[PDB]
Amino acid sequence: AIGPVADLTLTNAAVSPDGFTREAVVVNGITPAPLIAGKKGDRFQLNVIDNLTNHTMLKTTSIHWHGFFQHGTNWADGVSFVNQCPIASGHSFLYDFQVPDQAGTFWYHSHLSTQYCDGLRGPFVVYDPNDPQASLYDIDNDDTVITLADWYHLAAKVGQRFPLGADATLINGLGRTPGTTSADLAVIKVTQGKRYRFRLVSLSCDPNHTFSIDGHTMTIIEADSVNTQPLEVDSIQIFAAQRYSFVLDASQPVDNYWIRANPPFGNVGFAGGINSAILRYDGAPEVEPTTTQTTPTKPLNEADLHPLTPMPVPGRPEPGGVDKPLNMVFNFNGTNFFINNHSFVPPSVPVLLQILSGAQAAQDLVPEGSVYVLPSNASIEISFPATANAPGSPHPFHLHGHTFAVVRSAGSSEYNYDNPVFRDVVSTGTPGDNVTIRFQTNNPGPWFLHCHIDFHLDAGFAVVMAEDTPDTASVNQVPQSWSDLCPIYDALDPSDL
Ligand SMILES: *[C@@H]1O[C@H](CO)[C@@H](O[C@@H]2O[C@H](CO)[C@@H](O[C@@H]3O[C@H](CO[C@H]4O[C@H](CO)[C@@H](O)[C@H](O[C@H]5O[C@H](CO)[C@@H](O)[C@H](O)[C@@H]5O)[C@@H]4O)[C@@H](O)[C@H](O[C@@H]4O[C@H](CO)[C@@H](O)[C@H](O)[C@@H]4O)[C@@H]3O)[C@H](O)[C@H]2NC(C)=O)[C@H](O)[C@H]1NC(C)=O
Ligand SMILES: *[C@@H]1O[C@H](CO)[C@@H](O[C@@H]2O[C@H](CO)[C@@H](O[C@@H]3O[C@H](CO)[C@@H](O)[C@H](O[C@H]4O[C@H](CO)[C@@H](O)[C@H](O)[C@@H]4O)[C@@H]3O)[C@H](O)[C@H]2NC(C)=O)[C@H](O)[C@H]1NC(C)=O
Ligand SMILES: [O-][O-]
Ligand SMILES: [Cu+2]
Ligand SMILES: [Cu+2]
Ligand SMILES: [Cu+2]
Ligand SMILES: [Cu+2]
């Protein structure tokens, strides 16, 4: 795997991951983008080189490193017009950050418009040389990463605004459509008698996926970047941008077994081997599995996940019991999503730059209603009440700059102020849920908060949490090339975007 120091060269290319050629945004020649790897304590120097030529999929770009805190490097967080202006084609930009206090399973993706959908999305793993879970498995390497990607035959700008689901689901970059039921499937090799730490990464743009492996169970040991107490399951519903590590014990008979990743909409089920890949034991014939689906008897619920090392819930054990409660009221006008009456529109001057220039109060920050200012070292609680008014539910909400406690999950009326799982992406459920989260403001800067369905994000389903605006300038020392981005971008012709 490349990294922790590396060149990420962006180009446009024809790809056919599911048997059908279309143009894509690729990274060092491939989509999904390649695995970036390093270890706890590393310094990542990822030099993004923009050589994109296709305006329809955007020649400009910006890259987010999903799940990293970026403490004191808010400039590198990637999010376009919040954290930087876009990189222009013909240019480079070095993302330079440290990961001193974090390990686990992450990913990276374009954070401009719906560009990540057109192919700029890949896995990112930070290994812990003293992983507390290491005794549970034998093998954890580049070949134990499993990615899932909803794949479209029409490009994101050319297609529907809220598309009717994917054409294919890609498992490790490969899969089938109804029209291409003899395209190559991905194969994941195992050896009988060994235990694998599989790191499952959703690169999804919209649908969630219900993931299983015939004949096998999965012992979950990590949710997003957070180590969990081991939880054995046999089906996982993974929402856009979520991750899980799970241990698979490869001690079934030597055979081919179907790996299944069924989306809630699009092309559903398994006809012709769609939404499928192959788990192949060494020595088995190199042929499709003939295993059949078993009804799950131990599906994953977020309520059953708890952290491995105790992770104390900020604030006090009762609703609204924190320095700053917020409630996020979703709505939708048929075109744009709205949070507390406002649809995020990206500003010309990035929010960070606004703050550096001296804008530190919510009323002086543009766009007016979308930016909330938070005091430092303060406990926060945010509730995301699902509503008939925000269609496309369940919406998986993501907070940059933080992992957070999920005190109330989707499908639960219970509040857990004691030992809830922490993570960075959480499903806000269906009408009747009031999914609720907590975190401490210990990370000065402006951090995006949004639905990770990329079509909803591009339609304004976002706000910005500008924490500690007074110390934001001094804590986030900016490099000259970051300063150079906006003049270069603002100089561009509309057709060169
Ligand atoms: C920069 O990047 C962009 C984005 O990736 C690249 O865009 C590609 O642009 C080309 C055209 O320039 C485009 O091909 C065209 O696609 C349209 C749309 O197709 C859909 O239309 C219907 C959807 O509801 C549906 O009927 C249709 O289905 C059928 O299409 C063909 C049938 O033979 C089959 O392949 C397919 O399986 C299915 O049966 C599509 O889903 C299409 O209409 C175009 O064909 C046109 O037909 C009209 C009809 O009257 C004619 O008037 C036109 O003369 C024309 O023949 C054509 O196929 C790609 O779809 C775009 N790619 C993506 C991923 O969106 C762009 O190329 C790139 N630039 C460079 C320089 O590389
Ligand atoms: C999802 O969860 C959120 C967070 O819990 C929830 O928002 C909160 O709702 C409660 C009540 O529904 C709000 O609490 C109010 O606080 C003020 C006090 O300043 C008052 O309006 C109320 O206090 C009392 O009023 C009467 C006393 O005269 C009593 O008879 C009454 O019982 C109250 O105790 C009330 O407590 C709280 O302000 C919000 N938090 C926000 C908006 O940030 C939200 O409603 C939930 N959404 C869904 C759809 O379930
Ligand atoms: O994070 O998008
Ligand atoms: Cu993300
Ligand atoms: Cu993120
Ligand atoms: Cu959404
Ligand atoms: Cu984001």
CATH code for position 102 = 2.60.40.420
Nearest 5°: CA angle at 127, between 122 and 130? 165
Please name the helix (run of DSSP H) or strand (run of DSSP E) that holds residue 481, with its range, or none.
helix 480-490
d(CA 89, CA 223): 36
In the chain, the amino acid numbered 257 is Y
Ligand 3 neighbourhood includes 402 CB (under 6 angstroms): no
Experimentally determined by: X-ray
342 and 449 share a domain?
Answer: yes
Resolution in Å, one decimal, please: 2.8
Structure tokens at 410: 């989707």
Spell out where 250-387 has E strands.
256-262, 276-281, 324-327, 330-332, 337-339, 371-374, 379-385
CB 34 within 8 A of CB 122: yes
Q: Whose CA is nearest to atom 61 of ligand 1?
A: 154
d(CA 482, CA 284): 52
Q: Is the dihedral of CA 249, 252, 253, 254 positive or negative?
A: negative
Cα–Cα nearest to 338, from 460, 219, 201: 460
Whether 398 sits among the annotated catalytic residues: the reply is yes
Ligand 3 neighbourhood includes 121 CB (under 6 angstroms): no
d(CA 199, CA 246): 7
139 and 3 share a domain?
Answer: no
106 and 210 share a domain?
Answer: no
Sheet holding 218-223, edge to edge: 168-171, 145-151, 195-202, 243-249, 218-223, 226-233
Q: Which residues are registered as beta bridge partners of 279?
A: 188, 257
Whether residue 178 is preceded by a cis peptide bond, meaning omega within 30 degrees of 0, is no
465 and 330 share a domain?
Answer: yes
CB 22 within 8 A of CB 155: yes
Question: Which domain-ending residue is among 81, 110, 132?
Answer: 132
Phi first, then psi, for residue 179 (nearest 5°) are -70, -10
d(CA 28, CA 15): 13
d(CA 9, CA 6): 9
Reduce the DSSP state of residue 476 to 3 states and report it: coil
In the block, tokens 């606004």 appear at: 354
Whether 209 sits among the annotated catalytic residues: the reply is no
Structure tokens at 227: 């180590």
Whether 91 sits among the annotated catalytic residues: the reply is no
> Residues with Cβ < 8 Å from 264, sequence gap 6 or more?
207, 208, 209, 210
d(CA 240, CA 456): 12
Q: Which residues are registered as beta bridge partners of 423?
A: 404
Cα–Cα nearest to 108, from 119, 123, 126: 123
d(CA 444, CA 374): 9
299 and 350 share a domain?
Answer: no
d(CA 189, CA 211): 17
- Distance from residue 371's CA to the centre of ligand 4 (Å): 19
325 and 447 share a domain?
Answer: yes
Out of 71, 216, 395, 402, the active site residue is 395
- Structural domain including 22 reads 1-132
326 and 466 share a domain?
Answer: yes
Kindly report the three-state secondary structure assignment for every residue of 193-213.
Answer: CCEEEEEEEECCCCCCEEEEE
d(CA 131, CA 137): 11
Structure tokens at 167: 């054409």
Cα–Cα nearest to 425, from 109, 155, 167: 109
292 and 426 share a domain?
Answer: no
Count of Cβ atoms closer than 10 Å to residue 48 Cβ: 22
Whether residue 375 is preceded by a cis peptide bond, meaning omega within 30 degrees of 0, is no
Question: Which domain-ending residue is among 279, 309, 339?
Answer: 309
What's the number of domains the chain is made of? 3
Structure tokens at 450: 């949004």
Cα–Cα nearest to 181, from 255, 292, 267, 261: 267
d(CA 253, CA 255): 6
Whether residue 32 is preceded by a cis peptide bond, meaning omega within 30 degrees of 0, is yes
> Residues with Cβ < 8 Å from 457, sequence gap 6 or more?
450, 451
Structure tokens at 345: 């529109």
Q: Which residues are registered as beta bridge partners of 32?
A: none
d(CA 401, CA 94): 19
Q: Is the dihedral of CA 325, 327, 458, 430 positive or negative?
A: positive
Count of Cβ atoms closer than 10 Å to residue 425 Cβ: 23
Tell the burial category of 323 from Cβ atoms under 10 Å away from its Cβ (0-12, 13-18, 19+): middle
Please name the helix (run of DSSP H) or strand (run of DSSP E) that holds residue 26, with its range, or none.
strand 22-27
Cα–Cα nearest to 177, from 32, 18, 31: 18
252 and 317 share a domain?
Answer: no
Reduce the DSSP state of residue 238 to 3 states and report it: strand
CA distance to 191, 257, 355, per residue, from 253 (Å): 10, 10, 60
Spell out where 255-378 has E strands.
256-262, 276-281, 324-327, 330-332, 337-339, 371-374
**What is the 8-class DSSP label of residue 259?**
E
- Distance from residue 117's CA to the centre of ligand 6 (Å): 15
**What is the 8-class DSSP label of residue 486?**
H
Q: What is the 3-state composition of the chain as percent helix, strand, coil, each rounded to the nearest 5?
A: 10, 40, 50
149 and 102 share a domain?
Answer: no
- Name the pairing type of β-strands 425-427 and 396-399: antiparallel
Nearest 5°: CA angle at 365, between 359 and 366? 140
Structure tokens at 314: 């900020």
In the block, tokens 């390990």 appear at: 103
Structure tokens at 12: 């446009």
Q: Which ligand is nearest to the CA of 83?
A: 7
CB 245 within 8 A of CB 132: no
In the block, tokens 């609204």 appear at: 320
d(CA 66, CA 474): 24
In the block, tokens 């695995």 appear at: 35
d(CA 280, CA 172): 14
Reduce the DSSP state of residue 307 to 3 states and report it: strand
Tell the burial category of 334 from Cβ atoms under 10 Å away from its Cβ (0-12, 13-18, 19+): exposed
b/e burial code for range 139-175 (CB count within 10 A of at least 16 → b): bbeeebbbbbbbbbeebbbeeeeebebbbbbbbbbbb
CB 72 within 8 A of CB 476: yes
Reduce the DSSP state of residue 370 to 3 states and report it: helix
- Distance from residue 329's CA to the centre of ligand 6 (Å): 13
**What is the 8-class DSSP label of residue 441?**
-
In the chain, the amino acid numbered 31 is T
Question: Which domain-ending residue is among 278, 309, 340?
Answer: 309
141 and 222 share a domain?
Answer: yes
d(CA 230, CA 298): 13
Spell out where 161-233 has E strands.
168-171, 187-190, 195-202, 209-213, 218-223, 226-233
Ligand 2 neighbourhood includes 385 CB (under 6 angstroms): yes
In the block, tokens 């639960």 appear at: 412
113 and 138 share a domain?
Answer: no
Q: Which residue positions form the known binding site?
A: 64, 66, 109, 111, 395, 398, 400, 450-452, 456
